[PDB]
Amino acid sequence: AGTINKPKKPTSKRKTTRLRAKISKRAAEKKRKERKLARKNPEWRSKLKKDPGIPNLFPYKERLLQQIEEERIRRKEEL
Amino acid sequence: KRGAPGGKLKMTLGLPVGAIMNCADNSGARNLYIIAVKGAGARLNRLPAGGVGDMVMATVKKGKPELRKKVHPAVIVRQAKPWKRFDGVFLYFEDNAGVIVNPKGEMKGSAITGPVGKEAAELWPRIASNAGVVM
Amino acid sequence: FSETFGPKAQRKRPKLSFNTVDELAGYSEQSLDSYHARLEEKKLLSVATA
């Protein structure tokens, strides 16, 4: 495009008070509306979230699984 | 090709759109009413105009009824407005007159009454062949 | 449309209004006669002003 030699009308970054107030009002209305939709949401939600686990690149993941196994066996023996 | 001829020097245009000129050949028409000029430019409010040797679009108002309901290409061969040639001579004819041709420039009729202008004679070789006086 | 004409066309046999050689010759005869009659009626039936 011929932007460098012949630039067009600039896009103003100077906000107006009316537009700022309107944007704030619409943001607050959207936030209240999404609260209402989340309240009346029929979409299913699990009781317990899926835990991502231990990353593979952690250098002591196998050892950490060893204490996990040992602690569960100890809990089974205690119970 | 359009009817505008090349190699034509600038001259005074004496016949604007709306003029009625005599019909100088034997096609059957008695006069031609100019509705358009070939090669006319574009200006606001300006009437198109033609001079001697120009092709115009003309309508027969008096003549045979067979020629009546059509638009014909015509060539202006005589004009009454004085115009200057390159040798410094201003000149004019006693009437405005033209001949009906086809878009390629062959004449509809067979003979021309009265003289024709030089500019018409060089620009249209059929009119030069059908003219008895070149003047 | 794609199997009739084009890069993927599969049509080989045309649709003919005749079956034999004599029918072809006759059909060409009345075809030319009808074409001439249509030209004659079209002829019987500088631009014009608006």
Place this chain on the structure above:
Amino acid sequence: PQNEYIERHRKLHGRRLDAEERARKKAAREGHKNSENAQNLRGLRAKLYAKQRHAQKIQMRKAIKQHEERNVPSDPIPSYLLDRANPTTAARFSVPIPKVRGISEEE
């Protein structure tokens, strides 16, 4: 000229001498050109380009999935109804729309 005259000229004389090389270099530059189009087109042209690229990406994903999957009617109808185009075919006396927006007399 008549019939397939450009193909006959192709048979007799060939291409320009650099046609294959220029075509190969253009096909090579297509990736840079597509990224330049994705980052530099403006407006409605950019929006249409984005939707087109989205559609081609979805179609390419479907083609790859089908090629990976290559190595592995509904309602009973009689024989005279087989191979024809048939519809899929899927107290409170309430209508499907029990309530709509009210329209005032001024509207």
Place this chain on the structure above:
Amino acid sequence: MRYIHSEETIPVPENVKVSIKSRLVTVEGPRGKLQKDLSHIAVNFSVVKKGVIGLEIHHGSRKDVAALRTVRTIINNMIIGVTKGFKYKMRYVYAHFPINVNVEKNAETGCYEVEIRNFIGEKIVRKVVMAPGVEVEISKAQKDELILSGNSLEAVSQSAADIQQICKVRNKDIRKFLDGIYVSEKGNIV
């Protein structure tokens, strides 16, 4: 990621002289001398071994590490230019109007000039001026062939590109009108 140290290597032939001062590389060989300014790239030059030049970047990004490959290939191209040279063989073809190619050497510039006449019957005479250091001859072994030779690969290839781009067919079908001048072979003089 910022890489602590990255390095590239350029071997030098025995008859070649390399001088680097303030990133301005001068490469001299049997065929002559070439010179290029490389001060727009942050690089440290060194002599890591006899006949070996090392290029290193310290605490540079991936882009700064990758720029050393371009510097390596450019200096190797100057080395190949002063050792063996660069040669571009071009062919001009036509269908009906033979292309008349005249090659001359202008005395006051020292550069070669290639004049092209009768390109698809055109009355204009196209004139293309070669870069300084590019020599153009009309080949006698093969038919309708120009040979451009020099030390600078960029100069020779840009001259060949100018010769192609001056004979461009406009407003005609390129599947039918095949006249032009094309680069047919690229290689070394030696």
Place this chain on the structure above:
Amino acid sequence: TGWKDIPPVPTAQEFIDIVLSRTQRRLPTQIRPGFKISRIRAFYTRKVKFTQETCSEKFGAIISSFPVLSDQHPFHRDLMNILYDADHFKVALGQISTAKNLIETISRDYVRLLKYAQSLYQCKQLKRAALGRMATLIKRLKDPLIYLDQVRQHLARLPDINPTTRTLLVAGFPNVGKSSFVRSVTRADTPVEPYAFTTKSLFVGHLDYKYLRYQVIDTPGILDHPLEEMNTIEMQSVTALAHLRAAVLYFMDISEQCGFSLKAQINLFKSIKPLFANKMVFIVLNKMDIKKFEELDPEMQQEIN
């Protein structure tokens, strides 16, 4: 004259893109809700009318540019019926005209509704409705547009054969020398190759004899089986023999290096003889450098005589 003056026929999606880009870029696109309702109605009515006008111009150009098979000479009409399916041709152009008429009807209906629309939202919905319905109408024409573009390219590449002039029509089996004769007497670039059906379409050249222009027509080869079993390639030659009042040069190869029996050549000549009524027929015995007529069987010579 020919049929090279037909403008290119776009596809369905290209057609929709072209029409909508004209509507987007040749008209103003900014209307405000605070304007007058007559102003809003005029804006959206102008959009609908302009879209219909562009569609009507394109469809009318497609319809008027293509040949009318009812108005052609019998040779040209039957040649188009052989090369192209005549039913498919007429159905494709009828679908084009039907879509044009339906687009006009939709435009009239939505302009009448936009006369009574009361807000910018309603006007916008009516405009989008009209444009979407026209787009659906164009979308159902996916196959006729492709078919008509292929037909247009082939028609532009067709030879120009005058059916009412002096013409020498060369016919026979393949590999007998028809294209060799046509190439030797004219300037036409018909290929000459040793395999059968080298020439798959009609070719035409021209010559001058006694200051008169003669046209010479080279045809594909014809085999010895009835009209129900001949394909379109041989139907081109058969249509040329049936409808062009010409001088038929039937080329015969008595050497039989064409691959066909001379019995089959005699039988094909006898079979296509009824097309030769009111026409002038010359058996041209070609390849005399290989085998002469005197070398042939006297019974065979008796049959040829």
Place this chain on the structure above:
Amino acid sequence: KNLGMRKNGQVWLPAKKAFRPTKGLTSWELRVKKRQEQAAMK
């Protein structure tokens, strides 16, 4: 001399090496070992 044909015809280009700016950080034997504990852990 060069025995093969380069695709773009720039026969003066050298035999380039892979752009591996992280080359030399980890040895091969250690990577084989770490592959073994990685497979066991997975």
Place this chain on the structure above:
Amino acid sequence: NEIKIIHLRATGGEVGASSALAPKIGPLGLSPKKVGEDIAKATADWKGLRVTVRLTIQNRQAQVSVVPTASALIIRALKEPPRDRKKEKNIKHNKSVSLDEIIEIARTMRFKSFSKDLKGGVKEILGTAFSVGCQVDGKSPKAISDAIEAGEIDIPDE
């Protein structure tokens, strides 16, 4: 005095195979009708079947031979009813072929096969029969090939 070999595909009991053949044999100096008659005489035992013919030409006379092919042998062994090709098209070879004559076809094809064993030759012929579309012992030739590979059906060695 040179030997020249030309391979062609011909339909048995048909003269018109020389139609496309004669454009090149004519320069060599043979009679196309004579070559077609020789081809028909050689392929008289292959009525209605496309077979490949070797033409050996030397000193301007030609001798013909019928080169066996697996598909032609399987279609012949199917024993289809005699029929005309012009009025009956789009046919399917859905009849049954017995495994013994499949082994016989493999023994005939042993000279063309590079398989080490008659079992491999039989499996090649079964694949060709699968491509043809017939049945072996009332079952699918792929299924008999799988049974032979698994060892349920024993193929004789040589």
Place this chain on the structure above:
Amino acid sequence: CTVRIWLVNTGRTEHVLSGHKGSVSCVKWGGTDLIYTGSHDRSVRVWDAVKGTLVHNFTAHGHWVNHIALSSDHVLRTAYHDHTKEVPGTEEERRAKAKERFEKAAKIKGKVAERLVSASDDFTMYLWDPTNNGSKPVARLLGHQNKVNHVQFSPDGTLIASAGWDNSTKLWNARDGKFIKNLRGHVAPVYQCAWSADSRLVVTGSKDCTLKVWNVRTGKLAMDLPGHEDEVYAVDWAADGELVASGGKDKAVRTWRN
């Protein structure tokens, strides 16, 4: 695109009839040991059932062929069984009685000539007599405004009944193919039709969940049979004339009587 002939006791195929370019939608076996097939490749074929070779190829239909019908179908379906309700003592007598019934139902002008009719999606029907006319059809049966789904000869062989997708059942003279009368009672496409043994009555089962009994001599709707909750797919009239069976999308068999 094939028709396979099976021997019942072994289960083995004797002949495979191939040559159709589409799905073979209908097959009939005539009393002169011929096999008639109709297919979606717009063709009807007559095959010799003894040798397995094609005899006739009729390619005059313009679309899919849905149903074909023989003039002797009613007697070939029931063999030696008749109105007497006793069977002959031996196999030779039973075969002789079956052949006599077939010849009586298939004689045309004193000679045995099985008459064939085919209905297609091109809105048309074709009447063929392969023995006396070969490949030239006896008549083009014309008048259905939509696809013709089912066709049947009358047991006495004088009438042809056709059911179309234009909600109509049409009656045809079986000798020259002339249209006689149109039966107009259905509001959805008629799927099947069937004749009574006395050739007075036609039962038609349609998509509108109804059966209708038509008297063909008065040309009028004798009986209306509602009761199917959904579309009717299969309709049959017993050879005894006692019962009419119907079934369809509602999954329940319905038997209808006087």
Place this chain on the structure above:
Amino acid sequence: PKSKRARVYHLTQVNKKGREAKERLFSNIRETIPKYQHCFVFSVDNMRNNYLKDVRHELNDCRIFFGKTKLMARALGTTPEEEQADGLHRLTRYLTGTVGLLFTNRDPADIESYFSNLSQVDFARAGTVAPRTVTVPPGIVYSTGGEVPPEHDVPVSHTLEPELRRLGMPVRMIKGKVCLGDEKGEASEGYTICKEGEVLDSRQTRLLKLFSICLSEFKVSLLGYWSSASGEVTELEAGKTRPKR
């Protein structure tokens, strides 16, 4: 790294083999040691190697493995604790480069006689020395490029012209015929593909293959064989001279 080369997914039938091919090769070799009484190692280097199919066909009683060198070395057993038979670890010193295993029951003299009498004329590969100078003449370019006389030769196909131009031949299209210079052999010298003693590169060898000119031969050099009865590896003539690892 957003800027990356786009990898082309291949919509073709055959996939990459993987480790299952290696396991199949291991099992096939380890089941073919005990069935055969000699195991030869043969070398074919810088050769097209397409006649190994005919070698396999003619030696139908033998078994030939032509696989990855290190894969065959690990199949036979490099170390004495890993070897499948007594002395197979001695044979693995010859498995370098392009080698093949030949399991046989025949007398070794028969194998040596076969591979000494086996000669096939072959196209040269890149890197070999040209034995004779090949120069295509000016004028009409023929299919063999002057190897056979032009009267018995056929003109080369017109589709090969851009390939010859890409390989460096200054050919052109004249009336559908590929010509070097002019149709009458004027204004252009003949083109020398290869000279005496020059090392051939892939461009020259591709030109020679396109013109169907063979400048090399297919020779199988036997390095040595292991005998199952003695447990001993006998070294052959190329086996003394070839480097070992």
Place this chain on the structure above:
RNA sequence: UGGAAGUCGGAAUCCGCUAAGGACUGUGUAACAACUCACCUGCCGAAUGUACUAGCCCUGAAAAUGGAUGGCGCUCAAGCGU
């Protein structure tokens, strides 16, 4: 199919030899031929490939007097996060 040999189409798509090679991914022929791809081997030499997620950046639609992060101006900031 006039011709159709993996590559105008319809349907199947198996086996052998295998190191591996589709009853073929494209270019090509009137059909062949020829070239190319999938796959395999030799050379080389140590880390890569794919798909997502999170930051920052570009596009993700704009009219009409000349103008606005308040202005200058700012680029390891005079921008962004702590």
